Amino acid sequence: SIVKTMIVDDSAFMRNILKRILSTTNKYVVIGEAANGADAIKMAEELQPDLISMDIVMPETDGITATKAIKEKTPEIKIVMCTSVDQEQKMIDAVNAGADGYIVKPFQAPKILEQFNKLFP
Template identity: 40%
Template sequence: MSIKVLIVDDHHVVRRGLMFFLKTQKDIQIIGEATNGEEAVRLVNERRPDVVIMDLVMPVMDGVEATKKIKETSPDTKVLILTSFSDQDHVIPAIRAGASGYQLKDIEPDQLVAVIRSIHRGESQLHPKVASHVMTHLYQGEKKEEQLLEELTKREKEVLAEIAKGKSNKEIAASLMITEKTVKTHVSNILAKLNLADRTQAALYAVKHLGL
């Protein structure tokens, strides 16, 4: 069964080049082309491609916004970003939007075909330059969480550890020999300092960062 591909790029020459080469592949079927993100979203809803080859910088709607909308309306459609930009400001928003792959336009044609096939199989394909940005971003996220943990007082860390054990405020109060009202105050402070929504998130955070 052939892989249905939609090509999205505002440059006519790029679209023609991609179409010309991909049409030589027996297992790839070009089902359309779009010149901007808005067109891409409409065509995805109409034709349901397996893979969208998406440029980033385009008029009307850019590739990041289009990727986000496509993943909302057609979650099974895979998006491969194909662009000239490899900097973090372009990479991270595209990955966050739901792109399965991110490649640069200097990619060899045969390699591009291999990437399309991999993405269709459900694999993630990132250019080496791009992968390093993603890893740095993840590391910075981890580092930030650790810094937040350092803002907790010794008592707040003790309360957080008790939350991770599934204890109620009453049980925590008895365990730490403090009043229930004090526990409530500590819980509120913990959620605020760690930017967490509820006790469940606090418990998961504790398991991850307190080594419980």
């Protein structure tokens, strides 16, 4: 009934839009945010979310590196990549890294909820 969620994106305004969308749901409760993949790995270990929304392109450590690391340690965490046209070229890397789904910027709330609810019926 509650899905503990992390939001990872180097863009604060994209994190904020996604937080506002999820805030309208009792179900997806945001428990942490991170702005790069290294912080995401550490936060995932500390918080043990059910779900991570993972931007792909981020400075220093990207979402592919973070997805692989988190999947190696705690494979039960669902990781949904947060993609966009400018990240298209990294989507196959995310498939190979074990992503569980995708949501798309610019955000559409119904599509996000469809995607999340498929993983958390």
